Amino acid sequence: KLKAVLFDMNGVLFNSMPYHSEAWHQVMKTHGLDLSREEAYMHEGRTGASTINIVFQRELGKEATQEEIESIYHEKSILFNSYPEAERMPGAWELLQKVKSEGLTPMVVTGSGQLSLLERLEHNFPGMFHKELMVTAFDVKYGKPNPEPYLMALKKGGLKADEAVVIENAPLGVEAGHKAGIFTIAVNTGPLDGQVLLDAGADLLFPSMQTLCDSWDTIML
Ligand SMILES: [Ca+2]
Ligand SMILES: [Ca+2]
Ligand SMILES: [Ca+2]
């Protein structure tokens, strides 16, 4: 049975996705490339380099250079941080309290390298997370949708796949959790159809973090 809950960050702990999607759309627009807001949501969870290389390959037929990757990501971060800071996803704190009260270990598994958000995890969720029990952009070669980040969390936690549950909100992250062989709950906190989360391999679908929190004891029975 359950020992740990592996939380995605963007769109699960923080309501940051309207900002990430907007910044990704606008920065690519400045470089003359097309990435719609919807497409940014479909690429949620990917590393910055992978996101940039997908946009480049499908448009120009070539990948971006390291200098181009660094420059575009640099620009994206500045634009992300120009908006009022992302607030907590409603229900995330209450669920974290619930899982900790039940003796489960909270972990974070994110494709993010966004320092402003990562360094706000303690202030927003006091006493919940530890750096040794987190996987971020800094840990991975491939990143979501590769199961690598979730396999890394299991290792960091000393966990088997059947002792964990994944909470995800995006098709590439759901895929990552599912391909890691972990029970994966999708929470549809964005504008995409819930079908994409289920198609990606989600074992359950809830419309919000708060309803997941309301339903937690029932689903774990
Ligand atoms: Ca996410
Ligand atoms: Ca619908
Ligand atoms: Ca299914």
Automatic annotation (TrEMBL):
Name used for this protein in its record: Beta-phosphoglucomutase
Binding site for Mg(2+) 2: 175
Sites where the protein binds Ca(2+) 1: 8, 10, 44, 169
UniProt organism field: Bacteroides thetaiotaomicron (strain ATCC 29148 / DSM 2079 / JCM 5827 / CCUG 10774 / NCTC 10582 / VPI-5482 / E50)
Gene Ontology MF: a single term: sugar-phosphatase activity
Residues that, per the record, bind Mg(2+) 3: 188, 207
Record GO biological process: carbohydrate metabolic process
InterPro entries: HAD-like_sf, HAD-like_SPP, HAD-SF_hydro_IA, HAD_2, HAD_sf, PGP-like_dom2
Pfam families per record: HAD_2
Keyword Electron transport: no
Residue positions binding Ca(2+) 2: 163
Binding site for Mg(2+) 1: 8, 10, 44, 168-169
Classification via CDD domains: HAD_ScGPP-like
Matching NCBIfam families: HAD-SF-IA-v3
Binding locations of (R)-malate: 8, 110-111, 144
